[PDB]
Subunit: 618 residues, 3 copies
């Protein structure tokens, strides 16, 4: 077979007990209704997406046309003429119906220190935070930098920005001051929100000190709102720094929501690409929210009473779409988890799921492999309500898919392996929870409105039928597609739309097996996955070259048992240094300074570009 990974892989049905124990009526009746709805979404997207949008999203003003533009034109607009507000759809409309329903479960770094937050409380906090920004001069269309750990205040900040029509720009709280500066400068943000310190896995993160250093080079930032998470003494810049708790107490507990166009920008998410510095992937409002709600509902089988737990950081797209937007759009409860899967111990994920009766859990294989190595004795939890088990970021290997299905899910949960990207906004190739039969290691079948094609890598020609392999592209636009790269539409066109004209280029290889099931082969460009984080080899090379002793740098990606991919770094020293053992500590800190601890090199090879020869030798 051409797709060797599919050979003698049989599809597993959804387990019978999933339906027996399900608290509600499923959203689809079976694979027949998926196929019927899928074909309509491909053949008449105007009708299909108009209905999906009006089912799932409340518009202030109804839209006049589902979609205009084309892929090649790079001019796609969805639900044109509509007006709406994302915080209204995530908060107000649920507070209006059921103010005391729990919207957020905060699980703090220490067990036993969280709280639950109702939709009415969430409306209060979003409103008065929005008042703070408005009072300090933030206006519709301005960007706002967010540098926050996984606390509910992070949700408050995204949705407060949405409420006034500011464009939130979330920077992962593990980035260095250089990376924070770069993203804040490029977004031209004048307001930043952060914490005094972070606590994660019992370790203190000096967030405020990192922001202070970054802001020395961001002279357009005139206010910095600091949430007091630890109460530790931090440096304070009078006239610029403001205390979150002092400012929100000044302002009312309700604020009107700003009326936004369907195509006004909602957020920027800086993302590492094959070349160049990180790019600000821009999502607009209606189409992104329709994608988030539609996948939350049909992929994760989300019902209003559900308790949804995504393990990803708000600093990445998984956190954006599935910790925040999708569950709140659908009016269920979402879990904001501040700790690690290993603190206080390796049971922590399951401690959380059991205590809060989580119904769907969503994580990366990197965390599963780490926990699997830790040993099954850490998992002795009923978790009666857990019926969907999500996986994202890389393919979930056979032994991991089995361990996840059997030891975690008790053969009682549906494993949903979701393929997508920052640029797609939401799931694009994925089984639908409780509906689609699955194969270990396969992302299965396209989501509604996603028309995948397999392309010859060199000729760019379509390769028809089943049992084919090549480049993964989509033939048609879809509502939650990224709309531009901030400040650089030409880069957006060249990266995504001009490679294979008429198609959207994912950067990924893929096979489609005999049954039409998709198998993702990973990046055909210089993007690699390092312990759940999307990184550019070019980025790390630029960091290594920043050292005064390095002349030529080369970073390649090779498979690893635990991290998935193991980025390695070669360095050609300019002349010579007799302190090779010492130079290692200095190159390692250079990547720590340029990018962050999480991208620090495993080792720096000192030895005096055909990167493929390096990846094969390693």
């Amino acid at each position: 077979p051409v797709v060797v990974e599919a050979h003698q892989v049989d599809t597993f049905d959804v387990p019978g007990v999933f339906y027996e124990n399900h608290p509600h009526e499923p959203h689809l009746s079976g694979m027949n209704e998926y196929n019927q709805l899928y074909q309509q979404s491909i053949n008449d997207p105007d009708t299909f997406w108009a209905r999906m949008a009006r089912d799932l999203i409340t518009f202030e003003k109804d839209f006049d046309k589902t979609h205009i533009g084309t892929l090649e034109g790079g001019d796609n607009a969805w639900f044109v003429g509509g007006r709406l507000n994302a915080s209204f759809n995530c908060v107000d409309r649920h507070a209006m119906r059921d103010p005391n329903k729990v919207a957020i479960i905060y699980e703090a770094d220490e067990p036993g220190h969280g709280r639950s937050i109702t939709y009415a409380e969430l409306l209060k906090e979003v409103s008065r935070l929005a008042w703070v920004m408005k009072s300090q001069g933030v206006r519709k269309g301005d960007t706002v930098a967010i540098y926050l750990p996984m606390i509910p205040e992070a949700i408050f900040a995204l949705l407060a920005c949405a409420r006034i029509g500011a464009i939130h720009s979330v920077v992962f709280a593990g980035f260095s001051s250089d990376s924070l500066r770069d993203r804040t400068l490029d977004a031209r943000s004048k307001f930043i929100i952060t914490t005094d310190e972070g606590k994660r896995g019992g370790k203190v993160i000096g967030t405020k000190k990192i922001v202070d250093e970054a802001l020395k080079q961001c002279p357009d930032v005139t206010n910095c709102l600091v949430f007091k998470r630890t109460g530790a003494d931090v440096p304070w810049t009078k006239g610029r720094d403001l205390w979150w708790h002092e400012e929100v107490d000044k302002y009312p507990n309700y604020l009107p929501a700003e009326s936004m166009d369907s195509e006004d920008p909602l957020f920027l998410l800086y993302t590492s690409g094959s070349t160049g510095k990180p790019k600000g992937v821009m999502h607009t409002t209606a189409g992104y929210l329709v994608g988030a709600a539609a996948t939350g509902k049909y992929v994760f089988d989300i019902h209003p009473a559900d308790r949804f737990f995504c393990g990803g950081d708000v600093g990445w797209i998984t956190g954006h779409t599935y910790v925040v937007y999708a569950p709140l759009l659908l009016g269920c409860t979402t879990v904001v988890f501040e700790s690690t899967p290993a603190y206080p111990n390796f049971s922590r994920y399951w401690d959380v799921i059991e205590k809060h009766k989580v119904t769907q859990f969503y994580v990366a294989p990197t965390a599963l492999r780490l926990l699997k190595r830790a040993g099954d004795h850490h998992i002795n939890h009923e978790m009666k309500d857990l019926r969907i088990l999500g996986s994202v970021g890389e393919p979930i290997a056979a032994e991991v898919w089995k361990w996840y299905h059997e030891v975690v899910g008790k053969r009682q949960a549906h494993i949903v392996d979701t393929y997508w990207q920052t640029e797609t906004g939401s799931h694009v190739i994925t089984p639908l929870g409780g509906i689609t039969p699955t194969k270990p290691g396969s992302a299965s079948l396209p989501f509604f409105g996603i028309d995948p094609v397999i392309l010859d890598p060199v000729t760019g020609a379509e390769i028809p039928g089943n049992d084919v392999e090549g480049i993964l592209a989509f033939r048609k636009p879809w509502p939650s597609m990224a709309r531009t790269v901030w400040g650089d539409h030409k880069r957006y066109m060249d990266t995504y739309l001009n490679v294979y004209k008429g198609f959207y280029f994912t950067g990924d290889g893929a096979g489609r097996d005999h049954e039409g099931y998709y198998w993702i082969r990973g990046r055909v460009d210089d993007v690699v996955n390092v312990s759940g984080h999307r990184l550019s080899t070019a980025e790390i090379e630029a960091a290594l070259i920043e050292h005064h002793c390095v002349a030529e740098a080369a970073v390649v990606g090779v498979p690893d048992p635990l991290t998935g991919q193991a980025v390695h770094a070669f360095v050609a020293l300019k002349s010579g240094n007799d302190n090779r053992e010492q130079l290692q500590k200095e190159l390692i800190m250079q990547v720590r300074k340029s990018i962050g601890p999480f991208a620090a090199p495993k080792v720096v090879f000192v030895i005096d570009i055909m990167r493929r020869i390096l990846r094969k030798i390693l």
Copy 2:
């Protein structure tokens, strides 16, 4: 009886001739329809207030929900999702139907020098004044300071601010430069509107000189628009000062109205509270306007052809709600009266009512007592159309209520004693004109949507049934409730909502008599009424202490025959001064400087805190 003021007080029916001579059909059929509508407004406010609002107010976009939030939450919002504009509802919609109908009757300080202004003329003047502010950089959400006497230009200025979505902040034209400065700074206004001079009772008020001094300490004010009321030579600050007549002539006579949220702020009104400096009571848009229209209609029996005359200054809430918003909302004529009840003589109020055929008149008992002492020979006026006689600010005593009913109203008008506060936006306890039987000295029965309870002052417990006395609180929110204290929501919560959790605290004592009629006992806090003006004893104490010779100051309130309450001031001199007769003039001017002439002390006792011992001794 527990409510001793009610003992052997019989209810007086509406006089028969009120109905015989009424020009129209009344709004209610009787007390039965009041009771029916009142119970629905208490038991199903969502339905009741939705209908009332859609009856009385024209929305650009209909609202989606009548009310969200609670009293204890301090998050009340009314008619959420609606959009509207207050100047559209006060002007445009009446100009569109009947452009030549008279909206404003200006009665100037000199008799025979006013004019009448149609709804179309009012639309012109509001529009081009709004153009001036827009052209000078005023934007939606900015505050605008107004320091104007009772001339029609004051109405132009409030409604022009409303038209662009600026937040007008009216400062009584009798305040000192210190008080004007304080209110302008706290509101952070960048634009101010005033007159060259005021004329009232034949006396010149140097408004421009007072603004000039205040603006020396308001460096954010970049334009000051001066209406030429007297033409007197006033100081002029080139580059900042602008002539109203020169600027409006530049701009068109129509301007679009800005689309406002139901809960966008409409105005701030600085108000003296029990503690601290005056606070900016903030009203938003839809709920305030619904309250204003609903009381104008049902309390004052306002019909479109009516000529409505409120005697209160636009600088206070009575002027805001009943000189400006309520009558114009309902499309009748309102009288803007520039003089005093004593100039040229004590007949002046009745001269005005007779000449303009006023149908409803609304005044404070302080003015009635002053006129009553002047003698009945000043009142020899037919006033055929006068059918409603309103009283506000303190309880209308027995002898005054009789004199008002018999000598002024010819036993032909309904005396409507309206209890309310700046914070309630509009009447909350009041008879309804032509409907409710009244008792002298009683405010009678709650308005629609007002659920009064009597609370034990110390235990805060509800006291059920009739013939009870205690603290006056409301059990439920109502549309025109103040939404915050500007810049200090915590003070709003602590003052109004955290004293008796679940209730709104009025600051007033009250009895509910055997028939369920309410009798207002006055402020249980340190707020007193001085000749129609709400004042804080703390404020006057802070003024007296501003003198370099005063160490400890104490101001208390005791009843007075004419002013109602007689605030008195004790002073403990720091060491000693042998110029006691001279120090009196210097302390008196200090209060004149800090607050204004109207709050100047009756006498300052020089003699070296248990304020109750002082109030009892006096």
Copy 3:
């Protein structure tokens, strides 16, 4: 007869072949339906204009009233309460229906160097140009100076301004730096759009150098966007100047349209008046667009498939209304012509019409007379589709009307002589294409909603009936009337509305003949037409006086064979100069400097005000 120009002038019917060859069904059935619709537009304009507007314009929010205000009040507003966007109506709604339909045919200065632009391409270019302005801080209500030749980018710039609600202020690309400065200062524009150079008739126009000089005195202009039309080396001001092609490549190909009030300003067009410096005639949005569409449809018989060619520059109102707004509103194709009727040769107009199959052509008699003198051998073109021949700016004389009807139109096209002004927005007295019988030299009959009256010049009294002569005024407002003179509503009132109270004063004399046909006599004030350009004699006098040797200047207007009117200039030298031959070159350049080449004097008479004696002597 009183109207001597009408004596023995018979009406010519529309030629029969017009109907035989017409590609579609006409908009009116005949003169009977015109009369029926005309009487309704005069007798019930509220009903008539409500239907016309809703036929022709797509509103975001429907309007609540057709018209408020009066002529004498100077407060006219049309379609109040409506919301819409002009670029949506010129672009989006046609791109949504038929993205590949050709919107613009660009005919470049060199034949064979144009291109065709579809509605979808136009939506792209308008959107990303709007992004540039938004990114550089342009906001709704700001004015934007445009100094562009006849290239499609000029349409992009008007409609991008409309898209964000900026107010475009187009300056004819032949104006001098002084005139550009004056218009940019008075409009207080902070952004300007121009070209590096213009090419017209094979001659280079140094647009950038002219802007650079003007901007030295416009210190509020902080960005200048330069389109690279020639690629010639031009001076560059780093930090202010931006390249159009570099900036648009950064931004998305779609941008939401800003929601505008019916009465928000759409544009300013500076216009020479009888007295004073040029005035910024301001048009608002809904009424102007309704007038443009209604005349495009009913006067020019525009159908969606038509190819419409107006010969006027975008720098004047004919270009505004009929190169840009009317054809694009109606969704047909418009021709943007960059050259002159004489380059490369005198066939050029017909070369263009034949190659692009133009259906309607619209030009000034000044161009016709110039071509007629050139000789009929330059016209040997089929032009099968040419069915409407438009004339504007002055009366089309008998011999020219015949030459236009016979040699150009092959007796196959309807000659439509359209009378109107910058201030009327669109045609007001005109035959309707294919409907109205015409007389050579007459503008025939009023357009819908135009109620012309003939007034006695001195007594200002109406002169009833037919065969009368006098001043031309309109009795009623109409939707596309100019709404103010920018910054000077008083001048607007005094110029147009206070001369003859209750009427609109056109500045023109006119006769109404025995059949009720109108004959325009031209300006009764000091405005003259110089080779298709509206000019003030006062303006040229002020220019001549700017010379240090001129004391008193006098400019008068007399008829001319080719230019129509021949403005001449007399000068009284201050003392004396023995270089009279040299002084001529210096006075001629002074007018070239103050106004522009196109207003330079024919000759300056040096000889040491009763202007009528000068006009008669010449």
